[PDB]
Ligand binder design. Structure first.
Ligand SMILES: *[C@@H]1O[C@H](CO)[C@@H](O[C@@H]2O[C@H](CO)[C@@H](O[C@@H]3O[C@H](CO[C@H]4O[C@H](CO)[C@@H](O)[C@H](O[C@H]5O[C@H](CO)[C@@H](O)[C@H](O)[C@@H]5O)[C@@H]4O)[C@@H](O)[C@H](O)[C@@H]3O)[C@H](O)[C@H]2NC(C)=O)[C@H](O)[C@H]1NC(C)=O
Ligand SMILES: *[C@@H]1O[C@H](CO)[C@@H](O[C@@H]2O[C@H](CO)[C@@H](O)[C@H](O)[C@H]2NC(C)=O)[C@H](O)[C@H]1NC(C)=O
Ligand SMILES: CC(=O)N[C@@H]1[C@@H](O)[C@H](O)[C@@H](CO)O[C@H]1O
Ligand SMILES: CC(=O)N[C@@H]1[C@@H](O)[C@H](O)[C@@H](CO)O[C@H]1O
Ligand SMILES: *[C@@H]1O[C@H](CO)[C@@H](O)[C@H](O)[C@H]1NC(C)=O
Ligand SMILES: C[N+](C)(C)CCOP(=O)(O)O
Ligand SMILES: [Zn+2]
Ligand SMILES: [Zn+2]
Length: 528
């Protein structure tokens, strides 16, 4: 009588569910997990215990409601007859039935046309506990801070402004960055795409994260005054890291604490309609100029590390569908769109990344620019047509981090964009990157001087910065090692590794530049 296997299975995981709601059961989960953390020497025992205690409540709940829920587990184990396993199942959003206009590249701007200057800040990762002189090569996942201890007598401690290691930034270096903006300005707007807290991820309270949010927010507001700042939500803003429950999760373990703090912190910059969307799911749209829409995406609903998506990964918060409606509205008015976000779309979950790719291809004429960060390095992602994966039609700019993490100079970015006038293409025309050379800045008594590292069109000889120039650059770099070495230099903000990047390293790096869609190896067919 195997007619009972499904009854008993469901009875098992129903009892599993009830047991895992009990906090002493959750603590049992945490204790074993910590001993394995110590046994597998993942981190120091202090970090192992702290991070499991911080994560255990939310993670046990998600597993209880997804992988261990009776309908899911028994569906995996006994098949569609018993339950239904649909964890990370494929999904698709709906495009409107409006015919796609003919593909049309942006027009060259007329002589003397207005140029809008956009400051781009990402991955600031302020470390409230940064401490000069401490060990940069400590045993914790983040060093140069209180509790990192002392270096050996053979190596120096963490530099005053930062270190070339697994360390984040003292607030004074963030202050130095914004205080040196004058040469690079003036700015019409600032795009600020996430990651305010540091990587002290094993002990972050909601108050620490809010303190990071409110302190840095006030700092940029002090140095940029009247200039609008459009933020986007990074993966480090929440606690625990990457924990962004979609709006179908209510109660105090939801993201309400964080989104509302953002709506109050960013009220000076965001219109009422933006603040409403922001409070719901951490994304919004607004109009910087007549004929220009800006859309700030919360890419944590695309993230491979947002463990809440194990419950349901299908277009969380309805964001992609909301994006389509916003983009079609822009197409209807003839507006152009900027997209800003944190995690670049090539690094998203499979289904999300594929649907985003399809949206970008549909709205190629309407999308004018895309801006992401999160990787901390200086790179890009080229988008191609759906039909042949060979006509370049969009490019995402991945700007490098202000934080040193890991081992880099601090950096930031400025875009020259086809400006504020009727008929403008609103596309990026050129960009520039500024760095703080820590080797020089950390000399005792020196005053930090942020330097221009490079300008895009000048150093690569680009006629413009449209998608085809970046496509072309990748294939020039396939055959020109010196050119690729330049790019590899700039990629690390002027502080590349000493291990040379040979043939496999180059091909893997070039393949990432063409991988705007996750898990699409065909995109790199011409590289390997
Ligand atoms: C995880 O979340 C997703 C979404 O949040 C859940 O998917 C929804 O599931 C419910 C069932 O519980 C579906 O309800 C059915 O919808 C039928 C038709 O609905 C159409 O119109 C909807 C409202 O305008 C519209 O959202 C939807 O568009 C999209 O969904 C289609 C799949 O449903 C998809 O193929 C399209 O590409 C498009 O993106 C529909 O066209 C209706 O006939 C049924 O009676 C019933 O109402 C929702 O439609 C689902 N919505 C989406 C976007 O998929 C999913 O169940 C959750 N998973 C778990 C395990 O909870
Ligand atoms: C950061 O500052 C260091 C320190 O001066 C620069 O390194 C020097 O680079 C020049 C040019 O290659 C050499 O002649 C010196 O010998 C270097 N000094 C040392 C101590 O290595 C470095 O080039 C700067 N980096 C950037 C990106 O500006
Ligand atoms: C008495 C009873 O329940 N019999 C069913 C039988 O009709 C069915 O074909 C089989 C398939 O699982 O399961 C059992
Ligand atoms: C739920 C659903 O409709 N999924 C489909 C998927 O099966 C298909 O492979 C994909 C095409 O890329 O389109 C979507
Ligand atoms: C942009 O141009 C329009 C039309 O000339 C003007 O009204 C507006 O003040 C300008 N600036 C912004 C930020 O919209
Ligand atoms: C993603 N990364 C590990 C390469 C860069 C640092 O991560 P993160 O600070 O953006 O979360
Ligand atoms: Zn970051
Ligand atoms: Zn990040």
């Amino acid at each position: 009588w195997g007619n009972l296997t499904c009854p008993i299975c469901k009875g098992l995981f129903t009892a599993i569910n009830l047991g895992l709601k009990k906090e002493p059961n959750v603590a049992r989960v945490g204790s074993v997990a910590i001993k394995l953390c110590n046994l597998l020497k993942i981190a120091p025992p202090a970090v192992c215990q702290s991070i499991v205690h911080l994560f255990e409540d939310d993670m046990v709940e998600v597993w209880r409601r997804s992988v261990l829920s009776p309908s899911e587990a028994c569906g995996l184990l006994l098949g569609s007859t018993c339950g239904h396993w649909d964890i990370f199942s494929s999904w698709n959003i709906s495009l409107p039935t409006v015919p796609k206009p003919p593909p049309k590249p942006p027009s060259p701007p007329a002589p003397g046309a207005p140029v809008s200057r956009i400051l781009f800040l990402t991955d600031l990762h302020w470390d409230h506990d940064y401490l000069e002189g401490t060990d940069p090569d400590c045993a914790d996942p983040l060093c140069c801070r209180r509790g990192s201890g002392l270096p050996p007598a053979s190596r120096p401690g963490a530099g005053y402004w930062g270190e070339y290691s697994k360390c984040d930034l003292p607030l004074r270096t963030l202050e130095s960055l914004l205080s040196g903006l004058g040469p690079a300005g003036p700015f019409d707007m600032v795009y600020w795409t996430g990651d305010i807290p540091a990587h002290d991820v094993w002990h972050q309270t909601r108050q620490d994260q809010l303190r990071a949010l409110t302190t840095v927010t006030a700092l940029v507001r002090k140095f940029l005054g009247p200039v609008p700042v459009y933020p986007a939500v990074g993966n480090h803003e929440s606690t625990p890291v990457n924990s962004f429950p979609p709006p179908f999760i209510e109660g105090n373990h939801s993201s309400r604490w964080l989104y509302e703090a953002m709506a109050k912190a960013w009220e000076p910059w965001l219109p009422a309609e933006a603040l409403r969307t922001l409070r719901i799911g951490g994304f919004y749209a607004l109009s910087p100029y007549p004929g220009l829409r800006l859309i700030s995406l919360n890419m944590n609903f695309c993230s491979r590390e947002n463990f809440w998506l194990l419950i349901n990964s299908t277009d969380p918060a309805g964001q992609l569908q909301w994006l389509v409606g916003e983009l079609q509205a822009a197409e209807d008015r003839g507006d152009k769109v900027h997209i800003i976000g944190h995690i670049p779309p090539g690094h998203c979950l499979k289904s999300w990344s594929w649907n985003y790719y399809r949206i970008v291809a549909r709205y190629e004429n309407t999308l004018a620019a895309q801006f992401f960060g999160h990787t901390h390095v200086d790179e890009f992602e080229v988008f191609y047509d759906e039909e042949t994966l060979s006509r370049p039609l969009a490019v995402a700019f991945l700007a490098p981090s202000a934080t040193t993490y890991i081992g880099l100079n601090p950096g930031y970015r400025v875009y020259q964009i086809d400006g504020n006038y009727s008929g403008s293409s609103h596309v990026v025309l050129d960009h520039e990157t500024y760095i703080l050379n820590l080797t020089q800045a950390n000399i005792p008594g020196a005053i930090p001087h942020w330097q221009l590292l490079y300008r895009a069109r000048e150093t690569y000889g680009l006629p413009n910065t449209l998608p085809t120039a970046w496509h072309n650059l990748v294939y020039r770099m396939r055959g020109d090692m010196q050119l690729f070495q330049t790019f590899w230099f700039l990629y690390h903000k002027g502080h590349p590794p000493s291990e040379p990047c040979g043939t496999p390293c180059r091909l893997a790096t070039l393949c990432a530049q063409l991988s705007a869609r996750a898990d699409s190896p065909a995109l790199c067919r011409h590289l390997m």
